[PDB]
Ligand binder design. Sequence first.
Ligand SMILES: Nc1nc2c(ncn2[C@@H]2O[C@H](COP(=O)(O)OP(=O)(O)NP(=O)(O)O)[C@@H](O)[C@H]2O)c(=O)[nH]1
Ligand SMILES: [Cl-]
Ligand SMILES: [Mg+2]
Ligand SMILES: [Mg+2]
Length: 298
Amino acid sequence: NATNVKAMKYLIEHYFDNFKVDSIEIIGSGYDSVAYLVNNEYIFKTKFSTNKKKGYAKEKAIYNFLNTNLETNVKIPNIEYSYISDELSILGYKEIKGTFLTPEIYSTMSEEEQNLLKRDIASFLRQMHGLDYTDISECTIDNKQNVLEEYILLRETIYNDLTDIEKDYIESFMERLNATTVFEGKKCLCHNDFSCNHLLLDGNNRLTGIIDFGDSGIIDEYCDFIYLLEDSEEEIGTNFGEDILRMYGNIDIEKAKEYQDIVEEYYPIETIVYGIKNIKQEFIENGRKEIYKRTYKD
Ligand SMILES: Nc1nc2c(ncn2[C@@H]2O[C@H](COP(=O)(O)OP(=O)(O)NP(=O)(O)O)[C@@H](O)[C@H]2O)c(=O)[nH]1
Ligand SMILES: [Cl-]
Ligand SMILES: [Mg+2]
Ligand SMILES: [Mg+2]
């Protein structure tokens, strides 16, 4: 453990001239990134060269757009330090304080407390989705088209070596993609990774902050409800998402649910594609195995 922290302490002090690191610890990890808590006050997100070459550049541009344009009391990262290169990216901002929302915490809240949290979420999403996004228009994301391009990459690489069961799962997904209408609705600026591990509560169990706008862009409005609708151990549950949708208003709930169900079906394929793009066999195997689990569940 000691070694990572030392290298990262060195890089921070090297790229940010007057910054002194008095303490540093690992606070989180993705597959190709690490986050550190520094001086018990700053979050530094860091990444070495990955397949997404403009990754922390976009995230920084989004925080800068949002800190200029959002009217909200909910806090989000405000970037004070940034170093962006092909081989290394670092973003630093003052840590937003609070407690991450979990299913367990939610279940100890009174009905009224739950309602106020749902209302806070709806209001935040309303305010973000209603922004004029002209000034961030470079951050457009077309999920259908992205899926079609990932399918082409499969066909060019490993598709012919898959099993019939794997091929059928993929083709059956592509048929559903082609018949659906859920990519044809309102587009807006979405957080696009809006799960409860990115939502911070204050001491009264009200929403106080939101982190990780790394995947944000102009995309289907239904995107920000994918995790709120999700039934799993990590998320609160379908009822929670449904109530938030009703409070948010002027959105077709059945379509939001169809969008979530399609994204969920895609997950194993998305996992396979990640493995191909990043040359990680482990992800290709995991996604293929998950196809079998889903096929045999019923
Ligand atoms: N309390 C607190 N924790 C934070 C804050 N920013 C980041 N974290 C912590 O650091 C973890 C990683 O941050 P996050 O932005 O989600 O990055 P990531 O998802 O690991 N990486 P990437 O966004 O590049 O895929 C979060 O799960 C959380 O533990 C913050 O402002 N406050
Ligand atoms: Cl494999
Ligand atoms: Mg995250
Ligand atoms: Mg992220």
